[PDB]
Amino acid sequence: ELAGNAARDNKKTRIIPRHLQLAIRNDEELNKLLGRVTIAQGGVLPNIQAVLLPKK
Amino acid sequence: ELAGNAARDNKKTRIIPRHLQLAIRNDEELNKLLGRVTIAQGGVLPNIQAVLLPKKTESHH
Amino acid sequence: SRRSASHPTYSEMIAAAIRAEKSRGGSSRQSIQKYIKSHYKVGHNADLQIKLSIRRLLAAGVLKQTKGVGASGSFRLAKSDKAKRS
Amino acid sequence: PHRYRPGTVALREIRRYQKSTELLIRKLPFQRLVREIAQDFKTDLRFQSSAVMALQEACEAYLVGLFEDTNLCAIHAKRVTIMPKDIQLARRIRGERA
Amino acid sequence: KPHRYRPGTVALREIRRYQKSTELLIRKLPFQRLVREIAQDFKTDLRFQSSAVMALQEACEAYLVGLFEDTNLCAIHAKRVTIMPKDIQLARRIRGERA
Amino acid sequence: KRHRKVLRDNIQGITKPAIRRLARRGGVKRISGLIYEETRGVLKVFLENVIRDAVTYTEHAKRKTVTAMDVVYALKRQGRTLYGFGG
DNA sequence: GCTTTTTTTTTTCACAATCCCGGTGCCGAGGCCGCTCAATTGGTCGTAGACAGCTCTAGCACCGCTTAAACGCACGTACGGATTCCGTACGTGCGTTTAAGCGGTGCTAGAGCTGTCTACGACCAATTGAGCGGCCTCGGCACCGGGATTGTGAAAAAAAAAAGCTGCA
DNA sequence: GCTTTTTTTTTTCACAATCCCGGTGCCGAGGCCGCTCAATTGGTCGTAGACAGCTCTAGCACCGCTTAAACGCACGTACGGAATCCGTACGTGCGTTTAAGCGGTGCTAGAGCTGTCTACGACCAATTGAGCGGCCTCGGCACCGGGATTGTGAAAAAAAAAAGCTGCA
Ligand SMILES: [Ca+2]
Ligand SMILES: [Ca+2]
Ligand SMILES: [Ca+2]
Ligand SMILES: [Ca+2]
Ligand SMILES: [Ca+2]
Ligand SMILES: [Ca+2]
Ligand SMILES: [Ca+2]
Ligand SMILES: [Ca+2]
Ligand SMILES: [Ca+2]
Ligand SMILES: [Ca+2]
Ligand SMILES: [K+]
Numbered sequence: 086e087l088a089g090n091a092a093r094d095n096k097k098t099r100i101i102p103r104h105l106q107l108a109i110r111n112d113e114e115l116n117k118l119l120g121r122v123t124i125a126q127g128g129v130l131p132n133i134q135a136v137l138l139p140k141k
Numbered sequence: 142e143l144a145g146n147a148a149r150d151n152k153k154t155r156i157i158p159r160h161l162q163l164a165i166r167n168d169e170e171l172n173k174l175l176g177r178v179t180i181a182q183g184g185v186l187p188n189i190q191a192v193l194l195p196k197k198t199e200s201h202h
Numbered sequence: 203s204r205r206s207a208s209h210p211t212y213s214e215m216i217a218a219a220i221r222a223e224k225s226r227g228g229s230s231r232q233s234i235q236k237y238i239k240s241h242y243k244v245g246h247n248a249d250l251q252i253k254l255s256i257r258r259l260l261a262a263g264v265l266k267q268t269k270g271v272g273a274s275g276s277f278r279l280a281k282s283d284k285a286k287r288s
Numbered sequence: 289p290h291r292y293r294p295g296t297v298a299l300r301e302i303r304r305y306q307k308s309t310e311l312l313i314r315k316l317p318f319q320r321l322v323r324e325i326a327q328d329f330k331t332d333l334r335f336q337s338s339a340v341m342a343l344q345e346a347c348e349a350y351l352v353g354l355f356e357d358t359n360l361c362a363i364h365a366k367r368v369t370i371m372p373k374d375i376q377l378a379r380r381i382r383g384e385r386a
Numbered sequence: 387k388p389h390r391y392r393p394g395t396v397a398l399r400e401i402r403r404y405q406k407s408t409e410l411l412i413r414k415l416p417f418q419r420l421v422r423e424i425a426q427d428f429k430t431d432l433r434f435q436s437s438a439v440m441a442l443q444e445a446c447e448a449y450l451v452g453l454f455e456d457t458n459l460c461a462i463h464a465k466r467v468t469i470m471p472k473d474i475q476l477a478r479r480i481r482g483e484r485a
Numbered sequence: 486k487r488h489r490k491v492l493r494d495n496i497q498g499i500t501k502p503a504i505r506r507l508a509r510r511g512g513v514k515r516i517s518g519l520i521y522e523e524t525r526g527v528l529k530v531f532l533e534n535v536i537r538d539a540v541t542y543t544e545h546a547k548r549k550t551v552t553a554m555d556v557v558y559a560l561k562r563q564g565r566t567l568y569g570f571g572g
Numbered sequence: 573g574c575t576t577t578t579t580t581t582t583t584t585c586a587c588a589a590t591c592c593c594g595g596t597g598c599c600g601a602g603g604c605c606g607c608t609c610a611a612t613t614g615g616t617c618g619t620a621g622a623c624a625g626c627t628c629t630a631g632c633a634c635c636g637c638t639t640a641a642a643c644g645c646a647c648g649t650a651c652g653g654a655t656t657c658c659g660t661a662c663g664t665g666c667g668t669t670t671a672a673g674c675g676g677t678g679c680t681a682g683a684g685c686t687g688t689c690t691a692c693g694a695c696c697a698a699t700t701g702a703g704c705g706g707c708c709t710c711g712g713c714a715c716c717g718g719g720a721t722t723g724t725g726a727a728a729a730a731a732a733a734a735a736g737c738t739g740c741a
Numbered sequence: 742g743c744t745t746t747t748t749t750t751t752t753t754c755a756c757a758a759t760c761c762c763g764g765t766g767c768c769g770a771g772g773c774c775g776c777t778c779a780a781t782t783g784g785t786c787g788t789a790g791a792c793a794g795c796t797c798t799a800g801c802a803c804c805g806c807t808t809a810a811a812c813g814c815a816c817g818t819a820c821g822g823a824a825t826c827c828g829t830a831c832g833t834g835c836g837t838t839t840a841a842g843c844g845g846t847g848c849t850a851g852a853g854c855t856g857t858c859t860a861c862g863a864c865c866a867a868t869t870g871a872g873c874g875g876c877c878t879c880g881g882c883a884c885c886g887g888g889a890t891t892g893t894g895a896a897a898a899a900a901a902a903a904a905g906c907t908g909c910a
Contacts, residue, residue, distance in 0.1 A: 388834090389755080389756055389757065390833070390834075391757090391832090391833070391834095392832095392833090393831075393832045393833070394832080395832095395833095396832075396833065396834095397832070397833095399758080399759095413840095413841060413842090414841075414842080415840085415841060415842080416841085433850080433851080465822095468830090468831080
């Protein structure tokens, strides 16, 4: 359900690992369930600490 | 063996959880085997980070 | 809003700051900044304007620096003995 | 007249409590807490006394260890004082926290 | 007059580039050699399934990317922006990877 | 023939720009020059522990080839469970 | 220079807190004792896996071609970290208050043990349909070029926030 | 209350990167086939575990002493953190150098399958000794008090620097 929605937001007909990774890492519970699991070819969620951004 | 030695250094006939803890945590290898393990009534090894001490040395008898 | 700051000159405002604290260590840059707001009218660029004049007063020889380096330290006037303020 | 400098009695206590193995939380309060937390899972529960001790042993071990990790984060920021961000960073890095 | 981005701006750009992607970031053959090097030290004349070498690389890069996140938090904790080896050593000590 | 495996010091093939990319994915903005070597040692320790177990799994199976399952079972043991290569 | 004013350093002091060493209280380690159970012995029976022999995957070597990435250096910006200063959050210590802890007594919930009986899951053999590998195709998507859009950064111009200086309450 | 500076905007312009579209072409998702082996059906057979009934452990509730520990408050020291300031580490961008990746070809170790055959492990019933719970004794260890060592902090002396200021060359 959640992987599919991510494939749709990406304008892709097929689910691929990154869509599974986005699905899992943005869902609080699935992330806990899989907190010590590495999803190959998934990457990471976009996160840039606030402090590291420009002041403007 | 190790905990027995710990009890002997303590002038104690009997091994107690602290003797087992001291044995285990001062043995680099036993410490790794048992590093996500809690020894009821063992406490912790004496250890105070150096930046927390005062620095001045003037000494004992 | 305060529309201006009706005040003396900064070389005099910092010289007036040190004279109102007879301290042998000397007045710091934060102690002078605490004076100039609390007892005179001053800008919002003031703290930067306090720091800039103490570079002109150190380079001229008017203001002597006790402990420290640059505008991070504590200073005093070249002669302690003055006619009427202190 | 006589008084020790700040940190001196602290060090003395560090030495005291690292030397010993007694539980440091008071037992009855601890027990009351356990019972209370338990009530949100199942009503009118009973507890073997050793099960409470077993939970206190564990808690105290958990916290003592967390404080060790917390101290290191304090010291890493060139501080001697532990603060909530030190506990938070430790817990973040341990995997306990998001 | 020639265009120049202030320091930080192309770095921030790279972060975004790589966080959006999933390609392996270590070059494949160098990696593959290193694995075999290391593998000699335990057994001599070993072959690898290429999926075994890909599985290791996936696993490594994931661990390092992970360690960098914790290293970046330790750096920021101390009021910095620049990761340094004590950051890494702290992350790993709190992680319990290290004594 | 049999073509010996020349230990070339490949840890240095883990380039500076590669280490820098990994850190960009990790969200790191600025990087001490001391980082790139620290990392290599961190990476080596990682690779040794995984590859030792993997190769142990290989040996027990009486195989001359390390499989992707050897590696997977190794990463499971080391608490670094990997999805997408079997099991 | 000398003297003033800090700053540092030892000394010397007094002095708390800890450690150490010698006698007293009582509980649980350690061993003895009946005795039940679980390990052993000696037997039968069935298949797990060692082994050899064969198939053919896929792991390894080698080549040379393009070009993407790694490498090394020129240049300066903005970062780290030393120094320095200020305000109060903390640590020490005291006297007052609190409730833990201990030892004892009294009640019963419920843990846990036993024996009985049958509903349920293992095992088997025969039957047959789900899910396997193999295979084939055609649309999703990866890669490209081109143009539109966005964000960054330097320099210019306008708006509004301050400088010292003018006579003076 | 006046110029004459800043600083604080807003602006305008050039530039580079990223976004987004259609075009293109290739290859893997997807689905179909044909056969197999793993699920299903219907049957027997034994015992795992629910169930009822009983024993008695230990969990709970209460109580009232005795104090150790928690608390609240006064007081100041040392810390956290803001701010400056200075030197260069590390980011950016460029020209040159390197070798990863690519697509392909040839060779062969060794993964992985099959068939055979037997050593070894399950399973059994009879045998018996090691380890169980229960209970008693006495020695180790915990308390306690009251004496000795060990560090800390204040105050003083001293040393020693440093600070402020000048003579004299
Ligand atoms: Ca036998
Ligand atoms: Ca077989
Ligand atoms: Ca298929
Ligand atoms: Ca394609
Ligand atoms: Ca299709
Ligand atoms: Ca503060
Ligand atoms: Ca500080
Ligand atoms: Ca073979
Ligand atoms: Ca055999
Ligand atoms: Ca016994
Ligand atoms: K009970």
